[PDB]
Amino acid sequence: AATTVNGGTVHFKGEVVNAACAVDAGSVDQTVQLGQVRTASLAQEGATSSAVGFNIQLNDCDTNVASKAAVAFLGTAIDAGHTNVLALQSSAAGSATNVGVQILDRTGAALTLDGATFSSETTLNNGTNTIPFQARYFATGAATPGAANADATFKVQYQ
Amino acid sequence: AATTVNGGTVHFKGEVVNAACAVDAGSVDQTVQLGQVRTASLAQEGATSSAVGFNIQLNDCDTNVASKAAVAFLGTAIDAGHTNVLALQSSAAGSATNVGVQILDRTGAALTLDGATFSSETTLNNGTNTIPFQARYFATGAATPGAANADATFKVQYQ
Amino acid sequence: AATTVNGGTVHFKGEVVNAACAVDAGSVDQTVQLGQVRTASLAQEGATSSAVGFNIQLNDCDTNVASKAAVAFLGTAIDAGHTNVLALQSSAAGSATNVGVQILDRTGAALTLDGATFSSETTLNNGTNTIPFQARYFATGAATPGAANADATFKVQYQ
Amino acid sequence: AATTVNGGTVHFKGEVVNAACAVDAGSVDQTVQLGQVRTASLAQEGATSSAVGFNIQLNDCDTNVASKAAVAFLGTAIDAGHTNVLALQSSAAGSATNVGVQILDRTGAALTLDGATFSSETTLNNGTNTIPFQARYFATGAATPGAANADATFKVQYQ
Amino acid sequence: AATTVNGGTVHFKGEVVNAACAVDAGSVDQTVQLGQVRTASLAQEGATSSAVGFNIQLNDCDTNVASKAAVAFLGTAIDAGHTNVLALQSSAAGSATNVGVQILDRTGAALTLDGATFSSETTLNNGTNTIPFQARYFATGAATPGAANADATFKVQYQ
Amino acid sequence: AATTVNGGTVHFKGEVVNAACAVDAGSVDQTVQLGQVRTASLAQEGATSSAVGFNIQLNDCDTNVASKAAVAFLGTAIDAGHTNVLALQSSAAGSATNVGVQILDRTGAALTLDGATFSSETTLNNGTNTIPFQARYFATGAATPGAANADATFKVQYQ
């Protein structure tokens, strides 16, 4: 008779921005799988494999508010100096060696995973704008077998 | 020869309740994303956006044991007085301003995030009962860009 | 020479039940699309549009074991009080307003998305039984443009 | 004017291997549903139901590099001793009893979910090799109604 | 001009072992939820509910180094004498009564949470070995509503 | 009637810096797990295993204020002279021997855990800058089994 208990838990994930563009609910998080890459194939100093395609959906956009648009990516360096390529996940005893995922900016040139690296001339129109980006496999030298997992955060700037 | 080492770790999350309703294993924790909300859109004193939908699954329920059912939500106030709306996560230098997520009770009226606020006439039947709830964006005045993340805990009462 | 790597992943989805009815492998998950609904068309307090048709296939059924059969649906309320209608997906900044999908029980009367709402006199025969159900668009008042996506879980009771 | 916000998130899932075989992007994760199994049907000590079929696609394969090929599966034991059969998901209050999914190796004999159980003579050819495997329902005694969900990880060895 | 400040913090969690088996980075910590258990259901002296399934991934394994393998679990006793069952978390005013989680060894028989209780004949093969284990709800008598949370540490022995 | 008691406790963790970069709330503390490392694998004088990837998020950054950026790490020496590698946690009777975690600077060369070792040419842009860093396993000679846990503090300099 009269029993108070905790049902479950609800995670309210959200983020406030400007009146220029807003990422979709199911667009916030996207799963992009590169696949299994062979070491022999990526055993060259500066080797590049097929580039995966993916774009972040962003509905609710205006043109009078913001005309210009910038893009950036948040990640880690594959081999320190090579900040253009992403690094392994966190498997010190199960990851790969000199193997990562490079990020190409829609601007035309390859971007570097720095976070605040906003160097793109994206056009913002009235509707559901979308930011395209590529991500291929990049080797710093001798690719090794193991784990080639990682993560990146998308960035948008309204001007 | 003969090496004893610690494999890994196992988190045993559980909770004992009454013989009226029991939350499902994969129903215990649910990820609900509101998305990116524009300040200009939520720049009104008492502004409300689209309300997200979500229900907590609860299998194993009886009718002779408990007929009535109460529901409540655990969270924080957006602007103190507005305890009906949830508050920001914890980013003092990256969160939003006057922006939160309101909780609507299935009873019909809007509920306030107080925890012990059990004001709902939910009918408990024999089977897998479920508690519906909505959660839209609520502005206390001038919405600001940044972070609009938060969390809430579900509550159930058997009578 | 001798390289051990992780091929892929296999998700084994299953569920044990009684010897009365068993859902088919390809019948477990069904994709039902309502389509694009106009606000002006659903801008009435308690408006209803065309009802979609769909039935869950369930082979392997007995008659001596269970003669009676109950049915229920798991979902969320469109406007709290209106628990009979489903709610939006989770797009706080891209969903609709006062727009949802109602569920009609094969029993004749409209059922409410509560989960444990088993109120149907379904006849269980020897063979491949199937549970019919309808789902039309329901407006609580002034329909709004955006997203009208949601999900529901089917429920069966053997007696 | 000039507003920097976080767009979304991108999950870069990958894995480096040898120059013998590489799993396809859409082949990495496969959804295999067994369906609803009746207790009465699996209420025998060592009962087996229909076996589901599924094979992991693996393009980019060589023959001069690796001629032999091994296969293994990662999972849990249904009843401890019965490590050959998979166990329930994690629903302590919603799962089944003595009900699981057995794994059959393409080698001919049934394999046990141990992870490092590589006991198969798979032939590696030049092209897109594929590893076949079956998975039927296995009862340790008296099957119970509830949840029969689980997961397994595929394993490949190049020699 | 020239400002030195502390960025953040990095927790380097690791553990050195033998050349027989090594737990994966993301396998080190695993989240296993039992769910909500009803008192009436666990109100019997020595009552047992559904057993959850879970296995600790351990890549990098050899066969010539270690052939035999032992397993153990670290936890607390539910009711002192019943060291086979885990105890509550630490909520003296919010936990349950006579309610815990039992641990079943893959060896076939049920193991007791003692830590150094290595009584299993696990076979170590070349590749990614995995240790299966079950964990159901165990009542010492009259189950009570509240909190049924706890934790356990995995243990492995190479011989 | 009228009872004054202490509810709980709230830890207010914060840090004031310059107008060049500010670490995120959930970015302040990051959990990086290396995993289980085999002694035989790290039984070489100056052995290095897979390097883990991780970057500290830092939103709110300016370009006119600070253009150059320095980075440093705070930790202990694995074997005194080897200040480039981190040392064990504090388990004098449960830690490892000659086993630690090296830190690689994004500048390209490997950095030493000294704290005030700011030797990196990081570019500061307008937005959410991020500092990448790697951390692999480093052996001073004969690796031993036990504990390989440690901690490091991130450092940033604005110029």
Side-chain angles (χ1 to χ4, degrees):
Chain A
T3 327
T4 319
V5 292
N6 174 66
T9 46
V10 165
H11 191 257
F12 285 131
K13 202 245 159 274
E15 171 197 299
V16 202
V17 299
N18 219 275
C21 220
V23 82
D24 202 45
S27 196
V28 192
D29 196 0
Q30 271 135 348
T31 329
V32 184
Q33 293 130 92
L34 300 110
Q36 255 171 229
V37 60
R38 326 166 120 225
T39 144
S41 236
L42 239 75
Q44 293 97 257
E45 171 160 16
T48 47
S49 268
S50 202
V52 302
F54 54 84
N55 68 70
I56 183 123
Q57 275 96 307
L58 256 92
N59 63 92
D60 256 298
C61 315
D62 223 73
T63 358
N64 273 347
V65 180
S67 5
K68 225 56 215 79
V71 205
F73 245 122
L74 199 134
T76 344
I78 184 180
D79 259 61
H82 262 95
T83 339
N84 61 335
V85 194
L86 241 159
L88 286 326
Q89 246 286 295
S90 44
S91 317
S95 270
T97 320
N98 299 316
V99 206
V101 45
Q102 197 213 282
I103 41 139
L104 222 161
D105 204 337
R106 178 234 66 124
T107 183
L111 200 73
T112 172
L113 287 131
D114 245 56
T117 3
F118 292 81
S119 300
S120 11
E121 304 291 273
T122 358
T123 314
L124 218 71
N125 267 78
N126 203 86
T128 305
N129 232 58
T130 346
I131 314 151
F133 249 84
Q134 331 183 86
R136 72 197 152 187
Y137 262 125
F138 211 113
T140 344
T144 299
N149 321 62
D151 206 74
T153 340
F154 235 112
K155 299 268 177 228
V156 315
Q157 219 194 67
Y158 315 133
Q159 302 122 89
Chain B
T3 327
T4 319
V5 292
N6 174 66
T9 46
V10 165
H11 191 257
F12 285 131
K13 202 245 159 274
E15 171 197 299
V16 202
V17 299
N18 219 275
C21 220
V23 82
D24 202 46
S27 196
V28 192
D29 196 0
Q30 271 135 348
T31 329
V32 184
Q33 293 130 92
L34 300 110
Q36 255 171 229
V37 60
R38 326 166 120 225
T39 144
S41 236
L42 239 75
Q44 293 97 257
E45 171 160 16
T48 48
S49 268
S50 201
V52 302
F54 54 84
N55 68 70
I56 183 123
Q57 275 96 307
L58 256 92
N59 63 92
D60 256 298
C61 315
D62 223 73
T63 358
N64 273 347
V65 180
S67 5
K68 225 56 215 79
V71 205
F73 245 122
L74 199 134
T76 344
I78 184 180
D79 259 61
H82 262 95
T83 339
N84 61 335
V85 194
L86 241 159
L88 286 326
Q89 246 286 295
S90 44
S91 318
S95 270
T97 320
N98 299 316
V99 206
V101 45
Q102 197 213 283
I103 41 139
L104 222 161
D105 204 337
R106 178 234 66 124
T107 183
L111 200 73
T112 172
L113 287 131
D114 245 56
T117 3
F118 292 81
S119 300
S120 11
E121 304 291 273
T122 358
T123 314
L124 218 71
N125 267 78
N126 203 86
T128 305
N129 232 58
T130 346
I131 314 151
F133 249 83
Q134 331 183 86
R136 72 197 152 187
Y137 262 125
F138 211 113
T140 344
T144 299
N149 321 62
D151 206 74
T153 340
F154 235 112
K155 299 268 177 228
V156 315
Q157 219 194 67
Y158 315 133
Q159 302 122 89
Chain C
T3 327
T4 319
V5 292
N6 174 66
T9 46
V10 165
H11 191 257
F12 285 131
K13 202 245 159 274
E15 171 197 299
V16 202
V17 299
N18 219 275
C21 220
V23 82
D24 202 45
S27 196
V28 192
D29 196 0
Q30 271 135 348
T31 329
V32 184
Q33 293 130 92
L34 300 110
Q36 255 171 229
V37 60
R38 326 166 120 225
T39 144
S41 235
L42 239 75
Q44 293 96 257
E45 171 160 16
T48 48
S49 268
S50 202
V52 302
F54 54 84
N55 68 70
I56 183 123
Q57 275 96 307
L58 256 92
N59 63 92
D60 256 298
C61 315
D62 223 73
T63 358
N64 273 347
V65 180
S67 5
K68 225 56 215 79
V71 205
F73 245 122
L74 200 134
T76 344
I78 184 180
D79 259 61
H82 262 95
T83 339
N84 61 335
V85 194
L86 241 159
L88 286 326
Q89 246 286 295
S90 44
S91 318
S95 270
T97 320
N98 299 315
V99 206
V101 45
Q102 197 213 282
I103 41 139
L104 222 161
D105 204 337
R106 178 234 66 124
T107 183
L111 200 73
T112 172
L113 287 131
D114 245 56
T117 3
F118 292 81
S119 300
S120 11
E121 304 291 273
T122 358
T123 314
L124 218 71
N125 267 78
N126 203 86
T128 305
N129 232 58
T130 346
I131 314 151
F133 249 83
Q134 331 183 86
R136 72 197 152 187
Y137 262 125
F138 211 113
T140 344
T144 299
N149 321 62
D151 206 74
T153 340
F154 235 112
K155 299 268 177 228
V156 315
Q157 219 194 67
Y158 315 133
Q159 302 122 89
Chain D
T3 327
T4 319
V5 292
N6 174 66
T9 46
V10 165
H11 191 257
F12 285 131
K13 202 245 159 274
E15 171 197 299
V16 202
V17 299
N18 219 275
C21 220
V23 82
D24 202 46
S27 196
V28 192
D29 196 0
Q30 271 135 348
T31 329
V32 184
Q33 293 130 92
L34 300 110
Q36 255 171 229
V37 60
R38 327 166 120 225
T39 144
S41 236
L42 239 75
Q44 293 97 257
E45 171 160 16
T48 48
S49 268
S50 201
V52 302
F54 54 84
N55 68 70
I56 183 122
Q57 275 96 307
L58 256 92
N59 63 92
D60 256 298
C61 315
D62 223 73
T63 358
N64 273 347
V65 180
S67 5
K68 225 56 215 79
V71 205
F73 245 122
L74 199 134
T76 344
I78 184 180
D79 259 61
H82 262 95
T83 339
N84 61 335
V85 194
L86 241 159
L88 286 326
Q89 246 286 295
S90 44
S91 318
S95 270
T97 320
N98 299 315
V99 206
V101 45
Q102 197 213 282
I103 41 139
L104 222 161
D105 204 337
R106 178 234 66 124
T107 183
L111 200 73
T112 172
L113 287 131
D114 245 56
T117 3
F118 292 81
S119 300
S120 11
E121 304 291 273
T122 358
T123 314
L124 218 71
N125 267 78
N126 203 86
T128 305
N129 232 58
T130 346
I131 314 151
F133 249 84
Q134 331 183 86
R136 72 197 152 187
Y137 262 125
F138 211 113
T140 344
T144 299
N149 321 62
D151 206 74
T153 340
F154 235 112
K155 299 268 177 228
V156 315
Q157 219 194 67
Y158 315 133
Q159 302 122 89
Chain E
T3 327
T4 319
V5 292
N6 174 66
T9 46
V10 165
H11 191 257
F12 285 131
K13 202 245 159 274
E15 171 197 299
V16 202
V17 299
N18 219 275
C21 220
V23 82
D24 202 45
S27 196
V28 192
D29 196 0
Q30 271 135 348
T31 329
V32 184
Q33 293 130 92
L34 300 110
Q36 255 171 229
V37 60
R38 327 166 120 225
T39 144
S41 236
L42 239 75
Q44 293 96 257
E45 171 160 16
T48 48
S49 268
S50 201
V52 302
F54 54 84
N55 68 70
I56 183 123
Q57 275 96 307
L58 256 92
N59 63 92
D60 256 298
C61 315
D62 223 73
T63 358
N64 273 347
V65 180
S67 5
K68 225 56 215 79
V71 205
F73 245 122
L74 199 134
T76 344
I78 184 180
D79 259 61
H82 262 95
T83 339
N84 61 335
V85 194
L86 241 159
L88 286 326
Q89 246 286 295
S90 44
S91 318
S95 270
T97 320
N98 299 316
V99 206
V101 45
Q102 197 213 283
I103 41 139
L104 222 161
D105 204 337
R106 178 234 66 124
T107 183
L111 200 73
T112 172
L113 287 131
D114 245 56
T117 3
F118 292 81
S119 300
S120 11
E121 304 291 273
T122 358
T123 314
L124 218 71
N125 267 78
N126 203 86
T128 305
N129 232 58
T130 346
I131 314 151
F133 249 84
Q134 331 183 86
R136 72 197 152 187
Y137 262 125
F138 211 113
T140 344
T144 299
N149 321 62
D151 206 74
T153 340
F154 235 112
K155 299 268 177 228
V156 315
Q157 219 194 67
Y158 315 133
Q159 302 122 89
Chain F
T3 327
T4 319
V5 292
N6 174 66
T9 46
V10 165
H11 191 257
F12 285 131
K13 202 245 159 274
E15 171 197 299
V16 202
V17 299
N18 219 275
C21 220
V23 82
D24 202 45
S27 196
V28 192
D29 196 0
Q30 271 135 348
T31 329
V32 184
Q33 293 130 92
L34 300 110
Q36 255 171 229
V37 60
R38 326 166 120 225
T39 144
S41 236
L42 239 75
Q44 293 96 257
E45 171 160 16
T48 48
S49 268
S50 201
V52 302
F54 54 84
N55 68 70
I56 183 123
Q57 275 96 307
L58 256 92
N59 63 92
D60 256 298
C61 315
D62 223 73
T63 358
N64 273 347
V65 180
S67 5
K68 225 56 215 79
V71 205
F73 245 122
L74 199 134
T76 344
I78 184 180
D79 259 61
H82 262 95
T83 339
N84 61 335
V85 194
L86 241 159
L88 286 326
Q89 246 286 295
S90 44
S91 318
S95 270
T97 320
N98 299 316
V99 206
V101 45
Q102 197 213 282
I103 41 139
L104 222 161
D105 204 337
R106 178 234 66 124
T107 183
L111 200 73
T112 172
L113 287 131
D114 245 56
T117 3
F118 292 81
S119 300
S120 11
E121 304 291 273
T122 358
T123 314
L124 218 71
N125 267 78
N126 203 86
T128 305
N129 232 58
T130 346
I131 314 151
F133 249 84
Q134 331 183 86
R136 72 197 152 187
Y137 262 125
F138 211 113
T140 344
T144 299
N149 321 62
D151 206 74
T153 340
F154 235 112
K155 299 268 177 228
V156 315
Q157 219 194 67
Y158 315 133
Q159 302 122 89

